[PDB]
Structures are given as structure tokens and as C-alpha cells.
Design a protein around this ligand. Sequence first.
Ligand SMILES: Cc1cc(C)cc(Nc2nccc(-c3c(-c4ccc(F)cc4)ncn3C3CCNCC3)n2)c1
Length: 127
Amino acid sequence: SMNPPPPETSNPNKPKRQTNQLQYLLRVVLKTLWKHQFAWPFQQPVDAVKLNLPDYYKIIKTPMDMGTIKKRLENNYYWNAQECIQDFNTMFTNCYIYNKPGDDIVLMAEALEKLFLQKINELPTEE
Ligand SMILES: Cc1cc(C)cc(Nc2nccc(-c3c(-c4ccc(F)cc4)ncn3C3CCNCC3)n2)c1
């Protein structure tokens, strides 16, 4: 089935700010996860057309990915760190919902999620 448009990444009507926590989420968390050997399926929206997954967006109605998260952080789309953390969590949960436990893609997500959690544990205090 057709892909949906990717998630919104810029909103001129949405107020903006820079915080040490958002800067960390971009320069440490996103960067580190991006470079991980298992990152590639998570670096862009799931192309369900190319992958022949006609039911993907019947099941997943809140898609998310790290390509989108990168843009959101760049465009100061987020007011707070929790919005961004929520997007990462959504990204992983979608993968877990659509797939069978122990599947390759799930082991890949679990490793990335482990690393994510280790990094957010070291989220700096809001300065
Ligand atoms: C042949 C092959 C094998 C593997 C292991 C991966 C891929 N490529 C690829 N690219 C983007 C997505 C997925 C994917 C996802 C998925 C879901 C959510 C998310 F955030 C990230 C990924 N969930 C399932 N998949 C596929 C669907 C077809 N069967 C393999 C898993 N797979 C291609």
C-alpha cells in the first residue's frame, strides 16, 4: 500500500528554544545511535512500498524514525527533551508491535534501545 507522508519536522507556528538537554539529544544521543552497526533500518521512514509490507501502516499509526528525529532536533521542533525521548520510544515500540520477538529487526532495535537508555541515563541536568 502507499506510504504516508513522513512526520512533520518543521512548524513555523511552534515556539522554539535551545536547551542543554536538546543539544545533548542531538550531538550525543542521535549521533551515537546513528553510527551504530544496526542503525540503518531506523535512519528513515519505513518504506513499506519498497519492502512490500502492505499492512505496515494499517498497524502502525504513529510512525517514527531517526531521520525524522534528526530533523526535528535541527529545526528546534521540540520545546522539551521529553518530546524527543517520546519519539525514540515510539520508534522502538512500533518495531516491537509489528514484528515477532526474536526476529532480526527486533534484536537490532533492542540493541539500539539499550544504547539509547544508557545515553539518556546521562542526560545532563537542565541548565
Ligand atoms: C530483508 C530485510 C531484513 C531486515 C531484518 C531488515 C530489512 N530492512 C528494513 N528496512 C526498514 C524497515 C524494516 C523493518 C521494520 C522496521 C520497523 C520499525 C522501525 F522503526 C524500523 C524498522 N520492521 C520490519 N522490517 C522488515 C520487514 C521485511 N522483513 C524484514 C524486516 N526493515 C530488510
